[PDB]
Amino acid sequence: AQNPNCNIMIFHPTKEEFNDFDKYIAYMESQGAHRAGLAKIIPPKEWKARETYDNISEILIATPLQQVASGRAGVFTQYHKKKKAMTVGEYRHLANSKKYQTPPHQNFEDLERKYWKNRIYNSPIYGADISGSLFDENTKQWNLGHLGTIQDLLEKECGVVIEGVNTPYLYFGMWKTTFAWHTEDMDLYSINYLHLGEPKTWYVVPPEHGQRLERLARELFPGSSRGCGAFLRHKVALISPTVLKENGIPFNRITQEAGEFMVTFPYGYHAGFNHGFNCAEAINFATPRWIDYGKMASQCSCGEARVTFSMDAFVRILQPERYDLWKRGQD
Numbered sequence: 001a002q003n004p005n006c007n008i009m010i011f012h013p014t015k016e017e018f019n020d021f022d023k024y025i026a027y028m029e030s031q032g033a034h035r036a037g038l039a040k041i042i043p044p045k046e047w048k049a050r051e052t053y054d055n056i057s058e059i060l061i062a063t064p065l066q067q068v069a070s071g072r073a074g075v076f077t078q079y080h081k082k083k084k085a086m087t088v089g090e091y092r093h094l095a096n097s098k099k100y101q102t103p104p105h106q107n108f109e110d111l112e113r114k115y116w117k118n119r120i121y122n123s124p125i126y127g128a129d130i131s132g133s134l135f136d137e138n139t140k141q142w143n144l145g146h147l148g149t150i151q152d153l154l155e156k157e158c159g160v161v162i163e164g165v166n167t168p169y170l171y172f173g174m175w176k177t178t179f180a181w182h183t184e185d186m187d188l189y190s191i192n193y194l195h196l197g198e199p200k201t202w203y204v205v206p207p208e209h210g211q212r213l214e215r216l217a218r219e220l221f222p223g224s225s226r227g228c229g230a231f232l233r234h235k236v237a238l239i240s241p242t243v244l245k246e247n248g249i250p251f252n253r254i255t256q257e258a259g260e261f262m263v264t265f266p267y268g269y270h271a272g273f274n275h276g277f278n279c280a281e282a283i284n285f286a287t288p289r290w291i292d293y294g295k296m297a298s299q300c301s302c303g304e305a306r307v308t309f310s311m312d313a314f315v316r317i318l319q320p321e322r323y324d325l326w327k328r329g330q331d
């Protein structure tokens with residue numbers, strides 16, 4: 001069995017290997033990359049996402065989100081308070097302001113220590129989940145707006161034609177902006193490209209050990225767990241690496257820098273934070289190996305999770321027994 005310790009693997013494809021996206025995902029899995037839940041892919045030196053980032057300031061962040069924490073430094077939830085619209089140029093200036101800027105630090109490890117010590121005492125503002133793309137239309141390799149769609153994959157594997165669409169999302173971050181512990185919708189893969197700016201630190205639990213994280217979360221968030229049998233679908237809970245280690249939960253960590261891709265694998269729980277002003281692009285995708293994870297994905301039916309239109313068909317076809325309850329939680 002390849003990668004039996006479930007280490008995060010880093011790949012350096014050549015320009016020739018960068019042509020066929022599906023083939024390269026299958027290659028990484030042949031080497032055991034999925035066992036970690038997360039892999040890094042460093043593009044060949046010949047590749048670029050677009051020519052420059054000099055002309056992005058007029059993108060609108062319609063609903064910036066202030067991420068307010070509750071709890072203790074290593075075990076907390078966050079809620080998202082909506083703020084007034086602002087442009088990317090306005091948001092960048094805000095991120096660089098004395099109130100929000102990255103503090104002085106020695107290295108990524110010192111910054112990680114400061115994040116976990118101090119995150120709860122501040123409320124950073126995140127431009128998340130903005131439909132759009134920063135890949136040039138002429139970028140033919142690993143262009144996250146030109147991937148094969150999940151509806152086409154389901155149709156190819158299972159023969160059923162379904163409605164829905166699959167488009168990318170932009171994320172504008174600042175110091176301490178935080179992504180809570182989650183797997184993807186329907187336990188899909190994700191791919192994330194860090195277009196510019198400061199790094200993103202990731203934490204990940206191997207898919208084969210995801211239920212260990214779920215059991216700890218039920219212990220640590222006991223009211224939330226009574227409210228919903230899949231409350232991590234709400235994407236609000238944080239647990240630090242120190243708490244994970246104290247409770248014996250297997251995990252790994254890695255820092256993504258600008259110009260790098262990350263892939264999350266089906267049922268790979270992940271969480272993390274941004275180091276300073278940055279912009280990432282991400283999208284969900286599927287492969288044939290995903291189908292069995294999709295069929296077994298947990299679902300929130302309490303009303304909190306609310307998701308896109310396009311997830312309807314996935315539940316309806318893959319999980320018909322669960323469909324009626326889940327759809328009620330969507331309405």
Ligand SMILES: O=C(O)CNC(=O)C(=O)O
Nearest residue numbers: 171179190191192280282
């Ligand atoms: O970058 C973020 O805030 C969160 N991204 C992801 O969870 C992802 O790409 O799967």
Ligand SMILES: [Mg+2]
Nearest residue numbers: 056057058059
């Ligand atoms: Mg612009």
Ligand code: NI
Nearest residue numbers: 183184190264
């Ligand atoms: Ni994710």
Ligand SMILES: [Zn+2]
Nearest residue numbers: 228300302304
């Ligand atoms: Zn729920």
